[PDB]
Design a binder for this molecule. Structure first.
Ligand SMILES: [K+]
Ligand SMILES: [K+]
Ligand SMILES: [K+]
Ligand SMILES: [K+]
Lengths: 252, 252, 252, 252
C-alpha cells in the first residue's frame, strides 16, 4: 500500500492526520477540519451583503485569521511527517492548500506596505478565494470520483464545446440576416445574437420576444431542434465513465 | 405468506378489510375508501379560494367531520383485527393514518379551549394536512414501487444535492464578481445570485435579463453547460433501480 | 396473407385502391390522395385568419366541397370492394373516414334548416374537424408504429400522469402556504399555483418572478429538482417499445 | 490505401499538402491554414458592428482579399497535384472551396459593372459567406464523424420533423379554439399560435403569460407533457450511430 515513516514519533502523527480511520482522535480531527472549512465558506459568502459593505472591530476579520491559522498549521504538520517529498509536491491536494493561504497573506502584505505609506488586482485576489470549497475533496469520495471522471473524458468535453461553437456562429448569423430589414429588431449585429443562440440551444430560454419576423421564427425552431442533438451526442460517454469509476470502488 | 388470526369472528373481518380481492364487499370497501380520500383532497384544495376566505353553517366543516369519522373508524377496525402489534406499530401506512386524524382533533381542542376562554402554529398545522394524499399508497402499486426506489437510492440523491450545492456557490460567486462594476446590475450580493444559479443549471430559465456585462454572459454560458453534466451524472442509477423494482413484480 | 375477393371485377379495383404497389395507377391514386389531404389541412388552417374572419362567392367553400367529394367517393369504393364487412367495421382507418365527412354534412343540415327558417355546438363541430390529419396514417409507417407504441404502453402513461398529479398538488400547496404572509404575492389560492407547478416540474419555465420570499425560492428549487426524477422514471420503457416495433419491420 | 502521382515533382507536393503528418513543412502549412480560416471568421463577424456600419481605406477589405488569395492558391495547388479528376469533382471538401471564393468574386464583378456605370441579391450573397466555417472539417475528426452520423440517420430526422409538425398543428388548433371567447387573448388565429406550440413542446419556454383561460392551461399541460415523448422517441438511434462511428476509428 502506502509506505510509513518507520519512526518512533512519526508513524503516530502520520496515522493521526492522514488516516482518519485508525483512532478516535483521528476522527475528531477530521470533524474539526470539516467544521472549519464550512465556517470559512459561510464567512466568505456573508462578507459581501450590503449591510456590511485591521483587528478588534470587524469581528469577521477575527474569524478569517483563525481559519488561516488552522489551515497553515495542518499543512505544516502534514508536510513534515511524510516519507517522500517529490510525491508531496506532485500531489494535488497540496497545491490547493497553498492556494488558500495566499490571499490572506498577500492582503496583509499590502496593508503593511500602505501602513508605512489597483482595484483590479484586489478584485482578482478576492475572486481566487473561492477555491477553499475544493478542500472538501479530501473528505468526500464523490468529489474524487468526479475529478477522475473529468480527467478521463477531456476529448468529449472538447467535442461538446467545438460543436456548440459551430452551432452558435451558424444560427446567430442566420437570425441576424433574416431579421435585419425591420427597425424593431433587438439584433443589431451578429455578436449581439450570440447570447440568444446559446440560451435556446441549451433550452434555458431567453425570455424576451426577440425574433419578430417569420424567418426569425423558422430559424428559432431549427435552433431549438438542433441544440438537442449536438448536446446529447457526447454525454453517454461521460455518464459511462462516471458509472465505471463509481462502482469500481464499492464493488471491486 | 401472512398469518391469519385463526378465529371465528376475526378472519372474516381481516379478509374484508386487508385483502380487497376476496369477496365483493371487500371490493366495495376499497372503492368507498378511494372516493372518500379523493373527496378530502378536493375539500382541502377548494377551502382556500378567495370567495370563501363551528357546525351547521359552513357546510365544508360538515364534510371534514365525515371524512375524519370514516378514517378513524377504519383505523380502529384495522388495529383490533391484527395478529401482531409490534408489526402494527412498525408498519408505515399506520403512521400515515395517525397523522391525518391529528390536525382535526387538535383544532377541536383549541376551539374548545377558546370557547371556555399563535398564527404560526395554526399555519404549520394547516400545512401538515397535505399528507392525506399519501394514503393513496395503499391502493396503487406505483406509489409503493416509488417508495422502494427512493429508499434504495439515498446515496445518489445525496450526491445530486452535493454537486448542485457546489456548482451553485461557484457560479453565483463568479457572476457576482464579474458584474459588480456596473450600477445597473440586479445582483447586489452573492446570496442574491443563488436563485439565478439554480434556475439555469436545471434549465428552467430565469426570465429576466439579469446578466448584462460580457463576463456575465460568459459565466452564464458555462453555467448552462455544466448544469447538464452535474445533473445527468447520478440519474441512470435511479432509473435502473425503478426498472428493476417495477418489472420484478409483474415478471417474477 | 390477406384474402382477395376472387372475382372478375373486384380484384382489380381492390388491388388498385388497397395496394399502391401493384400498378402505376395505384401509385397515382396514392399521390392524389396525399395531395388532397394536404390541401384540406391548409384550407382548415388558413380559413381562420383575421382578414377573412353558400356557394360561388367564398371560394374556400368551393374547395372544402371538392375535398369532401373525393373523400366520400374513396370511402364508398373501399367499402364495396372488401371481402369481410365485420373486419371493415372493426378497422380503425374506417372510423376516421366516417368522422371527416360528418362535419360538412352536419353544417349543410343546419344551413338548410335555417334556410327554410347554439354557438357552443358549432364551435365543438369546428374543433372536431382537426382529425383529418390522422388520415395520413394510411400512408406513413411512422404514424402506424407510433400508434402501436402508444397502445402497448398505457400503464406507463398512467403512471406518468399519476406522479405528475401528486407532485403538482404537493408543491403548489407548499408554495402557497410558504408565501401567504406578504401582500405582494401573485398566489392567492392553491388552485392558482397549479400552473406554476406544472411549468417548472417540466422545466418549461414560468417567466414571471412569482416566488418572492425565501421559502418560495427553497420550494422552487425542490420542485425543479424533483420534476426531473418523476418525469425520467417511466420514459425508458416507452423508448424501448418504440425501438422494438420500429426495427422489427425493417430487420424482421 | 490512396494512390500517389508516381512522379518526380508531384509526390513531394502532394505529400506536403494532402498529408500533414509527413514532414515539418506539412505541419506548418496545416497550422497556417487553420489560422487563416479563424481570421476570416472573425472578420466576417466583426464587419457588422454598428460602429463600422474599394481599397486602401477600409482595411477590412485589405484582409478579405488576403484570405481569398490564400484560399484560391491552395485550391489550385490541390487540384493540379491529384491523380484522379473524377474523384476530385466527386469529393465534398472541394465543393466547399468553390463556394467560399465565389462571394468575393461576384462582389468584385458588380463593383466593376457599376464602376463603368437588388438589395435582396446582395443580402443573399452575404448570407452565403457563412460556409467558410465548414472548411474546418478538413482538420477535425469530430466534424467528419458528425457528417457521417447525419448522413446515416436521415430517416430518424424525417420522423422527428414529421411528429413535431403533427403535434404543432394539433395543439395550436386546440388552444386557439379553447381560448377564443375572451377578447384579452393574444391568439388571434391558428397560424398565430404555431410559435407558442414549438416553444413549449421543446421546453424552451414562451415567457409571456399567453394562455389565460382554464382550457388554455389544460391544453398547455398536455402540450408540455407530449413534447417530451415525441422528442425522445427517435434520439437513441442517432446517439448509437454517433457512438459507433466515433469508437470505430480509435478502437478499430
Ligand atoms: K430539458
Ligand atoms: K428546459
Ligand atoms: K423563460
Ligand atoms: K426553459
Amino acid at each position: 500500500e502506502r509506505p510509513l515513516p518507520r519512526r518512533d514519533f512519526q508513524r503516530q502523527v502520520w496515522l493521526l492526520f492522514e488516516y482518519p480511520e485508525s483512532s478516535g482522535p483521528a476522527r475528531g480531527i477530521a470533524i474539526v477540519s470539516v467544521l472549519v472549512i464550512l465556517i470559512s465558506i459561510v464567512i466568505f459568502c456573508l462578507e459581501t451583503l450590503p449591510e456590511f459593505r485591521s483587528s478588534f472591530s470587524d469581528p469577521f476579520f477575527v474569524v478569517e485569521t483563525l481559519c488561516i491559522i488552522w489551515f497553515s498549521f495542518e499543512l505544516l504538520v502534514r508536510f513534515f511527517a511524510c516519507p517522500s517529498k517529490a510525491t508531496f509536491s506532485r500531489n494535488i491536494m497540496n497545491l490547493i492548500d497553498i492556494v488558500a493561504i495566499i490571499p490572506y497573506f498577500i492582503t496583509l502584505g499590502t496593508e503593511l506596505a500602505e501602513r508605512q505609506g489597483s482595484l483590479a488586482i484586489l478584485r482578482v485576489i478576492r475572486l481566487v478565494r473561492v477555491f477553499r470549497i475544493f478542500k472538501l475533496s479530501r473528505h468526500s469520495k464523490g468529489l474524487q470520483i468526479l475529478g477522475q471522471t473529468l480527467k478521463a473524458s477531456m476529448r468529449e468535453l472538447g467535442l461538446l464545446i467545438f460543436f456548440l461553437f459551430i452551432g452558435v456562429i451558424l444560427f446567430s448569423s442566420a437570425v441576424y440576416f433574416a431579421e435585419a430589414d425591420d427597425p424593431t429588431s433587438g439584433f443589431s449585429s451578429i455578436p449581439d445574437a450570440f447570447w440568444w443562440a446559446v440560451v435556446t440551444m441549451t433550452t434555458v430560454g431567453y425570455g424576451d420576444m426577440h425574433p419578430v419576423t417569420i424567418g426569425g421564427k423558422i430559424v428559432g425552431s431549427l435552433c431549438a431542434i438542433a441544440g438537442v442533438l449536438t448536446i446529447a451526442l457526447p454525454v453517454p460517454v461521460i455518464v459511462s465513465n462516471f458509472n465505471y469509476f463509481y462502482h469500481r470502488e464499492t464493488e471491486g
